Design an enzyme around this catalytic site. Structure first.
Site, PDB file in Angstrom:
ATOM      1  N   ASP A 120       0.846  -1.163  -0.008  1.00 38.98           N
ATOM      2  CA  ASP A 120      -0.225   0.017  -0.059  1.00 38.98           C
ATOM      3  C   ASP A 120       0.954   1.284  -0.057  1.00 38.98           C
ATOM      4  O   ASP A 120       0.371   2.509   0.509  1.00 38.98           O
ATOM      5  CB  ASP A 120      -1.025   0.056   1.234  1.00 38.98           C
ATOM      6  CG  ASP A 120      -2.226   0.967   1.253  1.00 38.98           C
ATOM      7  OD1 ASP A 120      -2.535   1.246   0.090  1.00 38.98           O
ATOM      8  OD2 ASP A 120      -2.527   1.418   2.067  1.00 38.98           O
ATOM      9  N   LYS A 140       2.544   3.699  -5.838  1.00 38.52           N
ATOM     10  CA  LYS A 140       2.053   2.710  -6.677  1.00 38.52           C
ATOM     11  C   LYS A 140       2.963   2.228  -7.698  1.00 38.52           C
ATOM     12  O   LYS A 140       2.765   1.236  -7.909  1.00 38.52           O
ATOM     13  CB  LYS A 140       0.655   3.358  -7.338  1.00 38.52           C
ATOM     14  CG  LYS A 140      -0.227   3.747  -6.197  1.00 38.52           C
ATOM     15  CD  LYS A 140      -0.584   2.765  -5.193  1.00 38.52           C
ATOM     16  CE  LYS A 140      -1.237   3.315  -3.821  1.00 38.52           C
ATOM     17  NZ  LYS A 140      -1.076   2.710  -2.729  1.00 38.52           N
ATOM     18  N   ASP A 152      -3.381  -2.952  -2.386  1.00 37.77           N
ATOM     19  CA  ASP A 152      -4.443  -1.961  -2.397  1.00 37.77           C
ATOM     20  C   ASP A 152      -4.370  -1.238  -3.565  1.00 37.77           C
ATOM     21  O   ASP A 152      -3.278  -1.069  -4.369  1.00 37.77           O
ATOM     22  CB  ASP A 152      -4.530  -1.129  -1.206  1.00 37.77           C
ATOM     23  CG  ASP A 152      -5.570  -0.364  -0.959  1.00 37.77           C
ATOM     24  OD1 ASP A 152      -6.719  -0.868  -1.571  1.00 37.77           O
ATOM     25  OD2 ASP A 152      -5.454   0.764  -0.540  1.00 37.77           O
ATOM     26  N   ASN A 153      -5.675  -0.828  -4.072  1.00 43.02           N
ATOM     27  CA  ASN A 153      -5.465   0.435  -5.108  1.00 43.02           C
ATOM     28  C   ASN A 153      -5.259  -0.119  -6.548  1.00 43.02           C
ATOM     29  O   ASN A 153      -4.680   0.782  -7.244  1.00 43.02           O
ATOM     30  CB  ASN A 153      -4.602   1.550  -4.616  1.00 43.02           C
ATOM     31  CG  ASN A 153      -5.082   2.274  -3.391  1.00 43.02           C
ATOM     32  OD1 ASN A 153      -4.095   2.234  -2.474  1.00 43.02           O
ATOM     33  ND2 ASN A 153      -6.060   2.664  -3.071  1.00 43.02           N
ATOM     34  N   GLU A 194     -12.185   4.288  -0.397  1.00 43.88           N
ATOM     35  CA  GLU A 194     -12.302   4.585   0.663  1.00 43.88           C
ATOM     36  C   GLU A 194     -12.834   6.206   0.875  1.00 43.88           C
ATOM     37  O   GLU A 194     -12.470   7.036   0.186  1.00 43.88           O
ATOM     38  CB  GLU A 194     -11.139   4.653   1.713  1.00 43.88           C
ATOM     39  CG  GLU A 194     -10.042   5.528   1.437  1.00 43.88           C
ATOM     40  CD  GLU A 194      -8.892   4.684   0.539  1.00 43.88           C
ATOM     41  OE1 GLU A 194      -9.492   3.839  -0.344  1.00 43.88           O
ATOM     42  OE2 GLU A 194      -7.800   5.121   0.338  1.00 43.88           O
TER      43      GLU A 194
END
Ligand SMILES: CNc1ncnc2c1ncn2[C@@H]1O[C@H](/C=C/CNC(=O)c2cc(-c3ccc(F)cc3)cc(O)c2O)[C@@H](O)[C@H]1O
Ligand SMILES: CNc1ncnc2c1ncn2[C@@H]1O[C@H](/C=C/CNC(=O)c2cc(-c3ccc(F)cc3)cc(O)c2O)[C@@H](O)[C@H]1O
Ligand SMILES: [Mg+2]
Ligand SMILES: [Mg+2]
Lengths: 213, 213
Positions: B138, B141, B166-167, B196
């Protein structure tokens, strides 16, 4: 283009001459397939209530894009009322025209192809305008204040002319908002809502290592 | 700073030593006062179910930020299990430590102050690690794929090591996702959810012209 996809989706799914169904078709496609910068249904219901209150005879819209808010406003105008909408992108203006054509609202709307700063001074002479009853601002956010000062200079505002501005929080129009709230020439009211189509899809990936081979 | 505000809010509103209440306090403050890049409750429930399934003895977390996901994962670890979390910002790492301290989870977590690319090769020697059971990605990126290749090179993966990222859609990790999905060394599964805290507040301003003075 994304904007052609939207128009085609409406042509396949809405009912011709039904403005409500055209609005719902745009809203569904932008909630579950491609995000786009329409005002959306939640702020759109506030727009509706403001127009119903003031019953404007002549409305100016700044930034038509795909025609979502042109359809939302035109369907609520009384017989004989007019909307003028300015759009500088030729691609987008042609889409807005087909949107209104499909909605059956074409007779109440006049699309003006060009930049607000060029067209606003030609309004009275070329389009037989005296003063505006209502102005809806939804174009480039740094041009709200310049165009407001330009409308005042050109004599297009009268006492009681209603300006209504989208996105004053997000992405935000901070110079415009400070100016009108501080000026004795404007009485302001804020209607809090939510940005259009914002249930942003994301996810987690699980990747289990299997070894060298 | 925004991150100090979050920590102080928890200290005033959560119950000490209660990890669940700490998570809820962070979630409320970021839904109704300041957006922040925590994994959030909806993806957090998927995280919970994955950890419960695999019962990892040793977890590595990349990017602790405020400690939201460190608390979420540590509270679900069995007796003796360990989490190591890497955070390169000194401000953020101190906040994460106070978060876990407040939650009572400090004994299970070891915060590593520095950059993943510098620390990953020192894991076995300085922290008595053999192989990781689970890795939670996380951080920045564009570093998911480089760090995955680095973990493989350093011998930190075993067959069955669970990576969880994540993401992968928003803001997106397209090179990482293509690599693991195309590689015979990884078996992948996608868990779709929602970004979120994304009920973005905006509004309309009504400004009624009053005349020259
Ligand atoms: C400057 N004079 C002008 N004269 C005539 N037409 C003009 C124009 N400027 C722009 N236009 C046209 O207005 C439209 C531009 C609108 C700009 N709108 C936005 O940036 C916008 C952006 C968002 C937005 C939402 C979320 C987000 F993360 C980022 C942005 C939401 C909105 O409701 C928006 O209206 C285009 O159709 C453009 O061709
Ligand atoms: C590169 N090696 C590294 N080694 C150690 N720590 C590292 C690190 N890189 C970054 N970090 C730390 O990770 C954290 C960075 C996380 C980056 N995360 C995001 O960009 C992010 C961003 C969003 C996001 C959501 C909406 C949006 F419009 C734009 C972005 C959502 C998320 O869940 C995110 O995780 C910081 O605490 C940073 O100091
Ligand atoms: Mg807008
Ligand atoms: Mg994240």
């Amino acid at each position: 283009t994304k904007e052609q996809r939207i128009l085609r989706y409406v042509q396949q799914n809405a009912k011709p001459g039904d403005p409500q169904s055209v609005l719902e078709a745009i809203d569904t496609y932008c909630t579950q397939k491609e995000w786009a910068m329409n005002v959306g249904d939640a702020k759109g219901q506030i727009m509706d209530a403001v127009i119903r209150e003031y019953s404007p005879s002549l409305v100016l819209e700044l930034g038509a894009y795909c025609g979502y808010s042109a359809v939302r406003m035109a369907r609520l105008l009384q017989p004989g009322a007019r909307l003028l909408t300015m759009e500088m992108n030729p691609d987008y203006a042609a889409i807005t025209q087909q949107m209104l054509n499909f909605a059956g609202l074409q007779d109440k709307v006049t699309i003006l192809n060009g930049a607000s700063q060029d067209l606003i001074p030609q309004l009275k002479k070329k389009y037989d305008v005296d003063t505006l009853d209502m102005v809806f601002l939804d174009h480039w956010k740094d041009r709200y204040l310049p165009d407001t000062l330009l409308l005042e200079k050109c004599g297009l505002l009268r006492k009681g002319t209603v300006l209504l501005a989208d996105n004053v929080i997000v992405p935000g129009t901070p110079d415009f908002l400070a100016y009108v709230r501080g000026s004795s020439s404007f009485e302001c009211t804020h209607y809090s809502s939510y940005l259009e189509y914002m249930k942003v899809v994301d996810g987690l990936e699980k990747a289990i290592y299997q070894g060298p081979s």
